[PDB]
Amino acid sequence: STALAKPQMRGLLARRLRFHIVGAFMVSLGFATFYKFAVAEKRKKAYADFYRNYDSMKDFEEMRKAGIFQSAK
Amino acid sequence: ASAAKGDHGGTGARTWRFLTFGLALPSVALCTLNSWLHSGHRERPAFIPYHHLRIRTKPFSWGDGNHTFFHNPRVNPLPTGYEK
Amino acid sequence: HQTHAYHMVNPSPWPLTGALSALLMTSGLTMWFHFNSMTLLMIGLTTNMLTMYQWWRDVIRESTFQGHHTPAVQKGLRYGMILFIISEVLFFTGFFWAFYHSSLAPTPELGGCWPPTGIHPLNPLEVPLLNTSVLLASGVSITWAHHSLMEGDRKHMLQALFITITLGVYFTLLQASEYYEAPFTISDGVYGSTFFVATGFHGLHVIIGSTFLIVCFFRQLKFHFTSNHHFGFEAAAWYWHFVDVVWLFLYVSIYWWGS
Amino acid sequence: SVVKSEDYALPSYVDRRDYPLPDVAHVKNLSASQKALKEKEKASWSSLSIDEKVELYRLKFKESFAEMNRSTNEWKTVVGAAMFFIGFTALLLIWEKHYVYGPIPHTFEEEWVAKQTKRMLDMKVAPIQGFSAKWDYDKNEWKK
Amino acid sequence: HYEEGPGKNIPFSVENKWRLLAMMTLFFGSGFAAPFFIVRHQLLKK
Amino acid sequence: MAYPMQLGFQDATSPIMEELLHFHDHTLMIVFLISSLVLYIISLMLTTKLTHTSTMDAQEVETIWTILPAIILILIALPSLRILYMMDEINNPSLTVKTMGHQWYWSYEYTDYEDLSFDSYMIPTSELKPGELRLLEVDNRVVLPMEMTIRMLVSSEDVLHSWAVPSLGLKTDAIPGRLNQTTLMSSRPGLYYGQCSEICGSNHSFMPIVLELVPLKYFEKWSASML
Amino acid sequence: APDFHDKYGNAVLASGATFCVAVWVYMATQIGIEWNPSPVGRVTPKEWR
Amino acid sequence: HETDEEFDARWVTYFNKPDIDAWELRKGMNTLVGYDLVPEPKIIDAALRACRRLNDFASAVRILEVVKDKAGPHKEIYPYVIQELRPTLNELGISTPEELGLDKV
Amino acid sequence: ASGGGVPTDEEQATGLEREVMLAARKGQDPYNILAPKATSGTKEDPNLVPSITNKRIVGCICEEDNSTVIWFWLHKGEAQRCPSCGTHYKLVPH
Amino acid sequence: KIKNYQTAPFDSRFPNQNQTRNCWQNYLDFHRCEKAMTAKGGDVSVCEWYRRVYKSLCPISWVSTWDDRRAEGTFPGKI
Amino acid sequence: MFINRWLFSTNHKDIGTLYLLFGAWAGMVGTALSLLIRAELGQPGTLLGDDQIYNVVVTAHAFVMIFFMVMPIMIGGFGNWLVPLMIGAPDMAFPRMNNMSFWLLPPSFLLLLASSMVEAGAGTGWTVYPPLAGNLAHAGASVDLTIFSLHLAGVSSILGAINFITTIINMKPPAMSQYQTPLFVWSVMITAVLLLLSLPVLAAGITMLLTDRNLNTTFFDPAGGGDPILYQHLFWFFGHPEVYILILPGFGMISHIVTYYSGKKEPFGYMGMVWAMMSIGFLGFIVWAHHMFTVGMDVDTRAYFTSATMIIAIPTGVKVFSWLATLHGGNIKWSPAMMWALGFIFLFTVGGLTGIVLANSSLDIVLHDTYYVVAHFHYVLSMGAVFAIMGGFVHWFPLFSGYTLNDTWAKIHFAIMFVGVNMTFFPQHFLGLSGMPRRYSDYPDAYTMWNTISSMGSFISLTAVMLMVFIIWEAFASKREVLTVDLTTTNLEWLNGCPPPYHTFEEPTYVNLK
Amino acid sequence: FENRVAEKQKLFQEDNGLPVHLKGGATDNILYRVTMTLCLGGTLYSLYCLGWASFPHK
Amino acid sequence: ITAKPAKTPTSPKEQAIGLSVTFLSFLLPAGWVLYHLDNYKKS
Ligand code: HEA
Ligand SMILES: CCCCC/C=C\C/C=C/C/C=C\C/C=C\CCCC(=O)O[C@H](COC(=O)CCCCCCCCCCCCCCCCC)COP(=O)(O)OCCN
Ligand SMILES: CCCCCCCCCCO[C@@H]1O[C@H](CO)[C@@H](O[C@H]2O[C@H](CO)[C@@H](O)[C@H](O)[C@H]2O)[C@H](O)[C@H]1O
Ligand SMILES: CCCCCCCCCCO[C@@H]1O[C@H](CO)[C@@H](O[C@H]2O[C@H](CO)[C@@H](O)[C@H](O)[C@H]2O)[C@H](O)[C@H]1O
Ligand SMILES: C[C@H](CCC(=O)O)[C@H]1CC[C@H]2[C@@H]3[C@H](O)C[C@@H]4C[C@H](O)CC[C@]4(C)[C@H]3C[C@H](O)[C@]12C
Ligand SMILES: [C-]#N
Ligand code: CUA
Ligand SMILES: [Cu+2]
Ligand SMILES: [Mg+2]
Ligand code: NA
Ligand SMILES: [Zn+2]
């Protein structure tokens, strides 16, 4: 037989809170990085890639040949 | 301001009666003189059928629908001009 | 038995008759504007006056005759009256906002100017100035009446209160004459709209305030007020000063600056 | 035992784990044997039997902590009943579709939608991300 | 003066639950039905 | 135009609308973060049998609760206001077009040179040509030169309307007696759709806007042919 | 003593879930509702002009 | 504020008051369990002996229950506290809730 | 300039208004217009709570500036204690 | 004549979204100028810039109504 | 006796009961109107008619839900029942005027119903903007009946505000300062100040509309030098305070509910909660033109109104985090009222955050007059004000009636409503961002999926409303009488029993100064 | 005039159970009946007018 | 909260009746109007 050791008995709620607010912060950072990568930067790159060599006249001629315009046959 | 009078030792009933008869009612009497002096009908201006005046978007709920509530024939033209 | 100082009011029909009077006046105005008939409106105005008469009659019975207005009750009525006046200030503020909006930015339809082309304002130095002196004077005489009452002087309270009422009536008669003589009307675009709706609501409040002063005059004749307890007089005086201050703002804004 | 409406202004009994010692005992009236038990409680508690100790506890308190803190099967009823009423809602929607709604516009016919889709691609609707970006104009098919 | 206590401080009776069910049905049902019947009214006009 | 099951904004057709997309992405990240943090803290407060029910001191924690939100608001306001003033910048248009709202259609006036004006009405569903869009097509589109700064002036000849084209980031109320200005610059040719955006009576749902963006030379010849 | 939830909770949960899924799947798929899903990966574009 | 030891000592003194009355016993325990802590054995010991002086066996058992409850999911705290209290439990003839069957739902 | 003829409250106040006035003159507060001043609140020196019945609600502001008021019925009999701060109160029915 | 007019230029007097007064002022200026020029034996051609600006900015119905009211004698601006 | 008691009342509890009954009946009307909206929109095409009948339904939906359901229930119902009890007062200051605030509401509602029965109804939006609401585009009596309905509702609330302010200032125990009154009492006082200052400006604006329609004024008519935009300023000078009036009593009830079911004697951070409500009330008067970002205002004005609107997030955040800090360490009781309050904290936060999105005038150009605005305000109204109402109703029903609800049924009700409102309104964010306008009876085909889902969500909320009626019936049918209520030491309104006697605090509380 | 407030105080404090709005005597009942009859009758009339106005005429 | 057992218990059968009646009171009148919409419009 052996005695049980004295456990921590005070501040258990505050200890739990501190630990998980920290965890919530670290996750918030992890999510912000994911979001800037998966959403915000994705969008900036999609628009920059699209316009980098975009030829508006070629786009127009395609639309015109497809018949979409009132003003251009 | 202090305006130009004096007293403030006891603002009581006697002081406010003094103000009523010595300042307030004389002022009314002066302005009554001044008014009933510039009275008398000034001459009505040419009628011009301005579109921002004599508004009629719905007939008035009284009379013939075309006269304002305190219509004065002498000075209030209808949309078509002064009354005869 | 209670051991607080507040007033448990007897069950009363006047809230219901007042609410129904509001239904009859509003549905009555609708009938007048759209169905060419004044019948509902006249019933509503009648029941409204009956309600006001019996309701305030009962407040007098509860206070002068039954003693329910302890200091705590009176203090509540002071707050109630102050808050009511505040709501009325904000009501007028909406009409002043309308006036300044239209006059500070006159649109092309007006000529792009204020006063509009074709509007000939009243001279603010004629009857409008007289009306200003009249309401200012009545604020002096109502203050004399208040101090006479506090000093226990029945005759001079009545004299001063009578002079105050006479001046309120003078204002109302002068304003009615000015309405008749004015060469512009409520249908003369936004100039006439702001002029007559704002001064017209003010005139209605002069009539209300004058009526309240007259109620106080007859209660004073009947010895209801003591030299220390006379909240109905205080409330009427506060309302009267409110009516005076609204006039000064109308005079400066619409009659003088807006001319 | 019996709590009465007319007792509302008197100190009352409660089982709350954050108020372990309530304002009154659970049982105030004692029978002859219960009186004798309270007298015995003034002597060494080592001389009380287990049953006597339980009886003293149950005179003082209604439920133990374990009893007052017990979990229940109520969530099954709540979730199941909520799903039943949500399911009942779909019956209303079925009734509505059958008896209230008429045909939808002809622009939802399959051929119309196929032509409208081509025309959207021809005018390059949302060509950066939203729509035409998902069409492969070189291979003439939806991108994989 | 007035009745006090549960079921007595309300302008409707709860002495019989089935009479109550009828009254509550008329009360809440009339409020819910009214807009449908106003829509019907406006459609039948014109 | 919008497409089926769309979750976010129509793709940008103008530089200002691209700015708005990136600003929305920034602000939505913050919205998601705060909402998720509140949901998480709620769940944290509700998932322990540990208790602490005595009085808690508030002073210290309320500094965090005010200063951190104030910082976040500033981080929203700065790009918000930058875009606001960008949209306001002087830009020197090449063309002015007016649109007047009516019950229930739009008229357009191009009066820089010639007196060109016409009405633009929704195509009824029964008259759509195959592949045309229900409630969105018009008989006479607002033809405009692409890649050029256009001044659009908006008014109404009856009740309020509002002239909107989401993919260009445009919405200007149409108010009788008032001439409101906005600027329009399309980076691309094509067809860009909008819908009346102020309740205006029986056919508010049914008075749409269709811009047709083409090269200047085509715009010029179209203009001449519309006189 | 077993209460209502001990006696009937399992059946209420099971029957409620089953009923709810069945009726919403039916409503969603069998009565002609037009959900208007995306054409992407679904619709073969067809000549219109 | 004060050290842990100063806190514990104030509470020991509170329950050790020889003529502590029933109201003060309840006030003390109902206040103590509002704090973010499981009370030290030495506090519980003093409260149990106050129960003895007040001839209140049931409240002694209840105090043992509330120790277990304040530990929440920390299942190691209550057996430790009972271990530390066993001499007092034996001296005073206090049965634990478990020995009385009062841990059964 | 000045004269009389206006009744005074002493002459014409009636009803509850008059009761409050006359009691105040005597330094009495039967209608609870004033806040009572606390005693030390010990069992020896309890706060004395007047009542016209056998129970009255007490609110205890245990410490100056607490925003939380602690409410309980005080019954005729032995003094009772605020459940938060323990300060003693005793009913004095009359 | 310092021409090649495309549209009305930015006008610092009217820098905001509400352009009503810009239309109005140029309409007034054109007609004021035309009045001056017809009068003193001069050329309305000098007024042309105002004409181009107000015709660019002003809704057709506003111009039409203002023209009608000038003909009727009910135009409320000063010309 | 029946007429004396229920038509001639001067009793704050009975009048409170009258308001709760009126508000519940209005809630049924408002729910029916919401289902007609979503039936029209739940498949593409036209169901009822064109946009006139459609927007008469939309307009009445809003007026009924705001002026006849939320305000009567929160202020007239919970305010009259609870405020006097929470300060130990024997009634309201003006108990007879209080009864007229109640009895003005059935005539107000009658006027609104009349507006929809005559002519073609008032299809204007609840904002009633001219010129659509003027006498050419809305000829005939409908809009005038709407104006008069609002006049009566406004008088009712102005007099009620006078009553509440006077009662709360003047009728506390003499030892109780304003900083010893419960947060719900604070929330009602502040709401009453907002009503007192804002409703007279609405009254001025709608009276102007009335005279433009009937007396040939031209306040809003450019032909006379008027301006439609002036009406918008006057309306919204009231209308932004109005949304804080709709939420503040809810914040007060949430504070009490969260405190109670956390097993706490007090909310966390009492003075910060007072500060936050006062701050919200004050800032709510200086932000109105964020309802007008597309009307053509100058850029610096847009920048001011963007910034001043956003700062309201700071005091509101203090309240949210303080509710979380009240839960912290609680002995949590998972009552149905607690579920409503927890739903409130989260879903009100979501709606408040999309409100912050909309505060950005640049982004609001694209979001204004779209369903993104509709999504914002139903998160804070159907999932905020209404969740506080349901939480307060479930929590205090035993106080008012003396009988308990079946808690299992009330939890089932919460679950169904929670699913329904989120299915209704979450997809409307997508509809708004992708450009669906407000006040449309039909939409381009692309918007079909989310409109179909939103309409199905509205039918789930109908099922919850029907179930609520049954739950109330079951409680009165079974007559389980209340015995003991915990935490009365910090919840004075329960200390006189359930229901409390007709007269309470005939002998006032004893509170000394110390 | 003479101060007759004392007489009115006696009348309105008479222990007769009358509510204040009827405590003046039979005239109060008459004025109450007139007011309530006009209000209830007028409200019925307003409902009739709604009925009339709810349908197109001619 | 604690409470007395019901003075007038409402059995499951009784609750099914109350619930069914309550739901029908909402659904039948509105369903009647909606069922007959075309009759109103197509007239
Ligand atoms: C109860 C009703 C209610 C409430 C409380 C609110 C609260 C807010 N509302 Fe809303 N709103 C309406 C009801 C409401 N609103 C209605 C009905 C309309 C439409 C009117 C019509 O046109 O018919 C509308 C329209 C509306 C608009 C006009 C949009 C347009 O028409 O284009 C705007 C713009 O600024 C707005 C913004 C806000 C903001 C910023 C708040 C803020 O008070 C919200 C503050 C709350 C939070 C921010 C969440 C909690 C805070 C934290 C957790 C702290 C951390 C947060 C940050 C750092 C951001 N609302
Ligand atoms: C002499 C000084 C005092 C005068 C008061 C006279 C009667 C008016 C009563 C006061 C009501 C005040 C505001 C009502 C609005 C308009 C009246 C404005 C004042 C007035 O009397 O304006 C007159 C027009 O009255 C008209 O149309 C009259 C229209 C008559 C119907 C009255 C208005 C009916 C609608 C009232 C709505 C009330 C809404 C109340 C809201 C309260 C909200 C809390 C001006 O006459 P005129 O011939 O146009 O020009 C003079 C030309 N020589
Ligand atoms: C006991 C409580 C009080 C209850 C009050 C009930 C009063 C009911 C009387 C109504 O009488 C109607 O009044 C209409 C309008 O009042 C009249 O219409 C007439 O009235 C207009 C106004 O003078 C005319 O211009 C129109 O031609 C004409 O339709 C119409 O003959 C008549 O049927
Ligand atoms: C948004 C709120 C409401 C949405 C959901 C409403 C759910 C519907 C409940 C049922 O309503 C009933 O439906 C019947 C059809 O099932 C209708 O009978 C109609 O149809 C029957 C079958 O064809 C005929 O027997 C009847 O004579 C004829 O009135 C009946 O009138 C109507 O009361
Ligand atoms: C009869 C009465 C005396 C009052 C009283 O002592 O009973 C006197 C005293 C004050 C008088 C009033 C005031 O002197 C003011 C007014 C003066 C006018 O000349 C007559 C009416 C007028 C209103 C007076 C009527 C009447 O003569 C009053 C009322
Ligand atoms: C937000 N109003
Ligand atoms: Cu035009 Cu809406
Ligand atoms: Cu707002
Ligand atoms: Mg808009
Ligand atoms: Na539709
Ligand atoms: Zn205390």
Q: CA distances (Å), K397 to each of K413, K482, M5, in order?
A: 15, 11, 17
Residue for token pair 């939100």: F69
K474 closest CB neighbour out of M1, M5, M18: M18
Find the domain containing F227 and state its range. Answer: 92-227
Contact between chain D and chain B (3 or more Cβ pairs less than 8 Å apart)? no
Dihedral sign for Cα atoms in the order C16, C20, C25, C27: positive
Atom of ligand 7 nearest to the CA of F159: 1
K223 closest CB neighbour out of B52, B58, B61: B52
Question: For residue L42, which residues of chain K lie inside 8 Å, CB to CB?
Answer: none
H-run or E-run covering I47 = strand I47-51
Q: Is K32 on the interface with D (CB under 8 A)?
A: no
CB K86 within 8 A of CB K181: yes
Dihedral sign for Cα atoms in the order F61, F67, F73, F75: negative
Sheet holding F142-145, edge to edge: F142-145, F208-214, F190-195
Residue for token pair 């890649």: F147
Shortest distance between the Cα of D46 and any Cα of chain M, in A, equals 36
CB neighbour list of residue I25: distance below 8 Å, 6 or more residues apart: none
> How many residues in total does chain J contain?
79
Question: DSSP string of F134-158?
Answer: TTT-BSS-EEEETTS-EEEEEEESS
Distance CA H4, CA H36 (A): 12
> Three-state SS string across chain D, please?
CCCCHHHCCCCCCCCCCCCCCCCCCCCCCCCHHHHHHHHHCCCCHHHCCHHHHHHHHHHHCCCCHHHHCCCCCHHHHHHHHHHHHHHHHHHHHHHHHHHCCCCCCHHHCHHHHHHHHHHHHHCCCCCCCCCHHHEECCCCEECC
I6 closest CB neighbour out of C5, C67, C149: C149
Distance CA H61, CA D64 (A): 10
Residue for token pair 């009567």: K72
Distance CA K452, CA K41 (A): 7
Active site residues of K: 61, 91, 126, 156-157, 240, 242, 244, 255, 290-291, 316, 319, 438
> Hey, what amino acid is at L27?
T
Distance CA D96, CA K38 (A): 12
Resolution in A: 1.6
Shortest distance between the Cα of H47 and any Cα of chain A, in A, equals 18
Beta strand I47-51 with I88-93 is: parallel
Task: Compute, in degrees rounded to 10, the torsion defined by CA atoms K389, K393, K394, K397.
Answer: 170
| Burial of F157 from C-beta contacts in 10 A (0-12 / 13-18 / 19+) | middle
CB K98 within 8 A of CB K84: no
Pick the CATH number of K2-514 from 1.10.760.10, 3.40.50.150, 3.40.50.720, 1.20.210.10: 1.20.210.10
Distance CA H74, CA H76 (A): 5
Q: CA distances (Å), A26 to each of A29, C166, F173, in order?
A: 5, 78, 45
For residue F118 the two structure tokens come to 């016409």
Does any ligand 7 atom lie closer than 6 A to the CB of residue F200?
yes
The CATH number of residue A17's host domain is 4.10.93.10
Per domain, the residue ranges of chain M are 1-43
Neighbours of K76 (CB within 10 A): 25
For residue K510 the two structure tokens come to 């004893």
End-to-end CA distance of chain H: 40
Task: Compute, in degrees rounded to 10, the torsion defined by CA atoms L46, L51, L54, L56.
Answer: -120
Neighbours of L1 (CB within 10 A): 8
Question: For residue L50, which residues of chain K lie inside 8 Å, CB to CB?
Answer: 110, 114, 117-118
> How many residues in total does chain K contain?
514
Question: For residue K452, which residues of chain G lie inside 8 Å, CB to CB?
Answer: 33-36
D99 closest CB neighbour out of M4, M27, M35: M35
Distance CA K322, CA K314 (A): 12
Residue for token pair 């006090």: E4
Most distant CA atoms of chain C, gap in Å = 72
Q: Supply angle C-alpha K14, K20, K24, rounded to 5.
A: 150
For residue K381 the two structure tokens come to 């109204």
F contact test, residue of A50, A56, A59 with most F CBs within 10 A: A56
Q: Is D5 on the interface with K (CB under 8 A)?
A: yes
Name the domain count of chain J: 1
Distance CA F97, CA F109 (A): 6
Q: Identify the closest residue of chain C to I4 by CA–CA distance.
A: C153
Q: CA distances (Å), C43 to each of I49, K153, L31, L35, in order?
A: 55, 21, 15, 10
Distance, CA K129 to ligand 6 centroid (Å)?
A: 17
| Residues contacting ligand 6 via CB (< 6 Å) | K 240, 243, 355
For residue F172 the two structure tokens come to 């200007």
CB D96 within 8 A of CB M31: no
Q: CA distances (Å), K502 to each of K90, K296, K325, K497, in order?
A: 10, 56, 37, 11
CB I22 within 8 A of CB C67: no
> Hey, what amino acid is at L19?
P
**Ligand 6, atom 2: closest residue by C-alpha:** K240
Residue for token pair 């601006």: J77
Which of left, alpha, beta for K144 (phi over 0: left; psi -120 to 50: alpha)? alpha
| Burial of K213 from C-beta contacts in 10 A (0-12 / 13-18 / 19+) | buried
The CATH number of residue F202's host domain is 2.60.40.420
Distance CA B58, CA K134 (A): 11
Instruction: Name the method of structure determination.
Output: X-ray
Distance, CA K379 to ligand 1 centroid (Å)?
A: 10
For residue C198 the two structure tokens come to 């704002």
Find the domain containing L20 and state its range. Answer: 1-58
Find the domain containing G39 and state its range. Answer: 1-49
Shortest distance between the Cα of D128 and any Cα of chain A, in A, equals 6
Distance, CA K290 to ligand 10 centroid (Å)?
A: 29
Neighbours of C165 (CB within 10 A): 23
Q: Is the peptide bond before C115 cis (omega within 30 degrees of 0)?
A: yes
Question: DSSP string of K381-447?
Answer: IIIIIHHHHHHHHHHHHHHHHSB---HHHHHHHHHHHHHHHHHHHHHHHHHHHTTPBTT-SS--GGG
H-run or E-run covering K275 = helix K270-283
**Ligand 2, atom 34: closest residue by C-alpha:** C29
Number of helical H runs and strand E runs in chain A: 3, 0
Q: In this structure, what are the phi and psi dihedrals at residue F221, rounded to the nearest 5 degrees?
A: -70, -35
CB neighbour list of residue J3: distance below 8 Å, 6 or more residues apart: none
Distance CA D105, CA C77 (A): 65
CB F189 within 8 A of CB A59: yes
Neighbours of K4 (CB within 10 A): 16
Q: Is K477 on the interface with M (CB under 8 A)?
A: yes
Residue K40 is labelled as binding a ligand: yes
List helix spans (H) across K312-380.
Answer: 313-327, 336-359, 361-367, 371-380
Name the domain count of chain A: 1
> How many residues in total does chain I contain?
94
Distance CA I22, CA I29 (A): 10
Neighbours of K506 (CB within 10 A): 14
Distance, CA K354 to ligand 1 centroid (Å)?
A: 7
CB neighbour list of residue K412: distance below 8 Å, 6 or more residues apart: D77, D78, D81, D82, D85, K467
Side-chain-side CA neighbours of residue K454 (13 Å): 29
Q: Identify the closest residue of chain I to H24 by CA–CA distance.
A: I86
Q: Is the peptide bond before C71 cis (omega within 30 degrees of 0)?
A: no
**DSSP letter assigned to residue K503:** S
H-run or E-run covering A44 = helix A41-52
CB K149 within 8 A of CB K79: no
Whether residue I12 and residue L13 make contact (CB cut-off 8 A), yes or no, is no
Q: Is A48 on the interface with D (CB under 8 A)?
A: no
Question: For residue G4, which residues of chain K lie inside 8 Å, CB to CB?
Answer: 408
Distance CA H35, CA K401 (A): 36
Q: Is C152 on the interface with J (CB under 8 A)?
A: no
Neighbours of K78 (CB within 10 A): 28
Neighbours of C95 (CB within 10 A): 27
For residue F44 the two structure tokens come to 């944290």
CB neighbour list of residue H45: distance below 8 Å, 6 or more residues apart: H85, H88
List helix spans (H) across chain H.
Answer: 4-16, 22-32, 41-53, 57-70, 77-92
Neighbours of K479 (CB within 10 A): 22
Q: Is C203 on the interface with J (CB under 8 A)?
A: no
Distance CA K257, CA K259 (A): 5
Beta strand I55-60 with F161-165 is: unpaired
Q: Is the peptide bond before K499 cis (omega within 30 degrees of 0)?
A: yes
CB F161 within 8 A of CB F200: yes
For residue C157 the two structure tokens come to 């309270």
For residue M28 the two structure tokens come to 């039948």
K contact test, residue of L50, L52, L57 with most K CBs within 10 A: L50
Distance CA F105, CA E11 (A): 54
CB neighbour list of residue K115: distance below 8 Å, 6 or more residues apart: K60, K121, K122, K141, K142, K143, K145, K146, K149
Residue K12 is labelled as binding a ligand: no
Distance CA K326, CA K317 (A): 14
Distance, CA K58 to ligand 10 centroid (Å)?
A: 13
Q: Is M26 on the interface with D (CB under 8 A)?
A: no
Name the domain count of chain E: 1
Question: DSSP string of C171-218?
Answer: HHHHHHHHHHH-SS-TTSHHHHHHHHHHHHHHHHHHHHHHHHHHHHHH
For residue H104 the two structure tokens come to 């059964």
Question: For residue A24, which residues of chain F lie inside 8 Å, CB to CB?
Answer: 37, 40-41, 44
Find the domain containing J22 and state its range. Answer: 1-79
Does any ligand 4 atom lie closer than 6 A to the CB of residue D95?
yes
Question: DSSP string of chain F?
Answer: ---TT--SPPPP-SHHHHHHHHHHHHHHHHHHHHHHHHHHHHHHHTS------S----HHHHHHHHHHHHHHHHHHHHHHHHHHHHHHS----SEEEEEEEETTEEEEEE-SSS-EEEEE-BPPGGGPPTTPPTTT-BSS-EEEETTS-EEEEEEESSS-EEEEEGGGTEEEEE-TT--EEEEE--SS-EEEEEE--S--STTGGG-EEEEEEE-HHHHHHHHHHT-
The residues pairing with F152 across neighbouring beta strands, listed in sequence order, are F97, F182
Distance CA C132, CA C252 (A): 10
End-to-end CA distance of chain F: 29
> How many residues in total does chain C contain?
259
Question: Exposure string (b/e) for H57-74, b if CB count within 10 Å is 16 or more?
Answer: bbbbbbbbbbbbbbbbeb
Whether residue F132 and residue D105 make contact (CB cut-off 8 A), yes or no, is no
CB M24 within 8 A of CB M18: no
Q: Identify the closest residue of chain K to G4 by CA–CA distance.
A: K408
CB B53 within 8 A of CB B76: no
For residue B3 the two structure tokens come to 């305006």
Per domain, the residue ranges of chain H are 1-105
Side-chain-side CA neighbours of residue K491 (13 Å): 21
Side-chain-side CA neighbours of residue C37 (13 Å): 12
Whether residue C33 and residue K144 make contact (CB cut-off 8 A), yes or no, is yes
Distance CA I89, CA I70 (A): 13
Whether residue F4 and residue G48 make contact (CB cut-off 8 A), yes or no, is no
Size of interface A-H (CB pairs under 8 A): 32
Number of helical H runs and strand E runs in chain L: 2, 0
